[PDB]
């Protein structure tokens, strides 16, 4: 509707007989491949994530927010966990870090 | 032809012209208004030919090569149900946009949707696999990720036969 | 010639392949709009008769 890519803002200019438009957008660049998975499974239940997907540098899995690359530790604050470990296909086995259990050792 | 009628028709000053300026008008925005409707990706999206969508099955979408201007199979059953010169002074100009291209459009259109999702159209086309597409597009309207992965293979066949019944649809329905 | 519709693409699809922005661009655009014509007014009576 206002400009290609997704719209920040928009200002009006005076012309003759119109009106111009500058629309202000953001478009995303300079993108990297991944590897995906719909969820994670830790002690046979599945997460996944609350804003985000999960992806993996090659080695380690990591959350990240879906429109710019800021990878994140999976936590059990990031993820909510819905059902036993068995009826999603694509699920990767890996760590749900806790930030509870260092605390209290 | 008659130039005796001709010349009585000068008399009369500029409407002869007023009348083709204003058919010439309306016939170049019929080829702008095809043009704004399909002619609305950067580049022509091709869909993988290993066809693996979670079990999706956009099969009757998606053209055929082997079908004329390789058309999907509800395309052609749409330009079978619509099919139903110059004497003097009328001349019919062909449209800028061929069929087989506004095929492609929308083949372009589709294939980008069904690998990218709605990316391509704010930028780089980015590849997501579908089921985790249909995911996002659940979150958009109130439901979490994991009703649609609990219920993948339910929704997908809810999918494909809801496909099957346009097709039906079609094929019959006058 | 006959037109070519744009630039061939193959995006990299598979069943755990994404791809992330890791950054951005931000495009103003412009978009010119008419929203009014010359306020004209002929005198039938004097156009015709004058």
Known sequence: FCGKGYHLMSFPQSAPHGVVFLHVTYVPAQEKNFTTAPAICHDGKAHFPREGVFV????????????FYEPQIITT????????????????????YDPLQPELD | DSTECSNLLLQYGSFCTQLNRALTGIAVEQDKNTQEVFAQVKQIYKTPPIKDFGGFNFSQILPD?????????IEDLLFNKVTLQKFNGLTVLPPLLTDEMIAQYTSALLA???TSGWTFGAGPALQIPFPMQMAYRFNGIGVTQNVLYENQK???????????????????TP | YTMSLGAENSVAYSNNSIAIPTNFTISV????????????????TMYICG
């Open chain 2, 65 to 73: 090569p082997s079908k004329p201007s390789k058309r999907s199979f």
């Open chain 1, 56 to 67: 993996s540098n090659g080695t380690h899995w990591f959350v990240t927010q879906r429109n």
């Open chain 3, 29 to 44: 655009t412009t978009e010119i709009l008419p929203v009014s014509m010359t306020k004209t007014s002929v005198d039938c």
């Open chain 1, 77 to 96: 604050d990031n993820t909510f966990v819905s059902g036993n470990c068995d009826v999603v296909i694509g699920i990767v086995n890996n760590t749900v």
């Open chain 2, 154 to 172: 339910l929704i997908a066949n809810q999918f494909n036969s809801a496909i099957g019944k346009i097709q039906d649809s079609l094929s019959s």
């Open chain 2, 112 to 114: 980008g949707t069904i």
